[PDB]
Amino acid sequence: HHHHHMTSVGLIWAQSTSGVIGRDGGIPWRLPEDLAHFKRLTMGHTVVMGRRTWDSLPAAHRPLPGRRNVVVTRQTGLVAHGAQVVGSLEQALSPAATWVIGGAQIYALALPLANRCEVTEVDVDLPPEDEDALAPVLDQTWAGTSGEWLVSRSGLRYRMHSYRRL
Ligand SMILES: NC(=O)c1ccc[n+]([C@@H]2O[C@H](COP(=O)([O-])OP(=O)(O)OC[C@H]3O[C@@H](n4cnc5c(N)ncnc54)[C@H](OP(=O)(O)O)[C@@H]3O)[C@@H](O)[C@H]2O)c1
Ligand SMILES: CCc1nc(N)nc(N)c1OCC1CN(c2ccccc2N2CCC(C(=O)O)CC2)C1
């Protein structure tokens, strides 16, 4: 349903090579270069996230500055300030390039509607654990390109993949 709307809908996430995106209510690695990449791609745009991701943000970073923060929840509203709440992904997207920034539940809702995915792969050894949030799997409707492996100042290797709907 990526052509049920006019504005581009992009998913953006970072994952380990094993496909983990979240653990224990947070992200189980630190990668400053990915944060800068995420900031450059999203600055000045609407960012849409699930409520658990909203609550996972450290207070210094909530709301994400310089972006319209939209939080998808079934609740009437939120205790933590700075978001616009909506009750569905469709309400998040219209009116409106909108970035869906996680987590796994909101990626699953948005994947059928998305035109683009921007993935950072982090070469950190994290065998998936029972409660982990995992990255969405991309099917045959996506075409991708991949950048070279880069080395972070902290020593972790990482790289970016970019997918567009065929
Ligand atoms: N690595 C990355 O790039 C990345 C990015 C973002 C997040 N994360 C990680 O992902 C994890 C959180 O992901 P998650 O999947 O547990 O949660 P999530 O997708 O962030 O949020 C789930 C919440 O969204 C709301 N929601 C879900 N489906 C809905 C629907 N159909 N209609 C309305 N509201 C709906 C509900 O909020 P209510 O309960 O309020 O109703 C639900 O509890 C954390 O570990 C976080 O650190 C990682
Ligand atoms: C940087 C992590 C990330 N990476 C890619 N590639 N995709 C994503 N969806 C993604 O999750 C973005 C959300 C979760 N985040 C976060 C989590 C923990 C500590 C700091 C942050 N934030 C605060 C605001 C900063 C900003 O000003 O942008 C960015 C870092 C914002």
Q: Cβ(12)–Cβ(117) under 8 Å?
A: yes
Resolution, expressed in angstroms to one decimal: 1.2
DSSP state of 26: B
Experimental technique, in short, is X-ray
Nearest ligand by distance to the CA of 53: 1
Backbone angles phi, psi at 133, to 5 degrees: -85, 130
Q: Following DSSP, what letter does each residue of 58-82 receive, concatenated?
A: -GGGSSPTTSEEEEE-SSS--SSSS
DSSP state of 16: E
* Amino acid in the structure at residue 145: T
Whole-number Å distance between alpha carbons of 120 and 162: 9
Ligand 1 centroid–CA 133 distance in Å is: 9
Q: Following DSSP, what letter does each residue of 127-157 receive, concatenated?
A: ---TT-EEPPPP-TTEEEEEPPPEE-TTS-E
Beta-bridged to residue 16, according to DSSP, are 122
Residue 97 annotated in ligand binding: no
DSSP, collapsed to helix, strand or coil, labels residue 90 as helix
**CB burial readout 66-88, b (16+ within 10 A) else e:** ebebbbbbeeeeeeeeebebeee
Whole-number Å distance between alpha carbons of 89 and 49: 9
Nearest ligand by distance to the CA of 15: 1
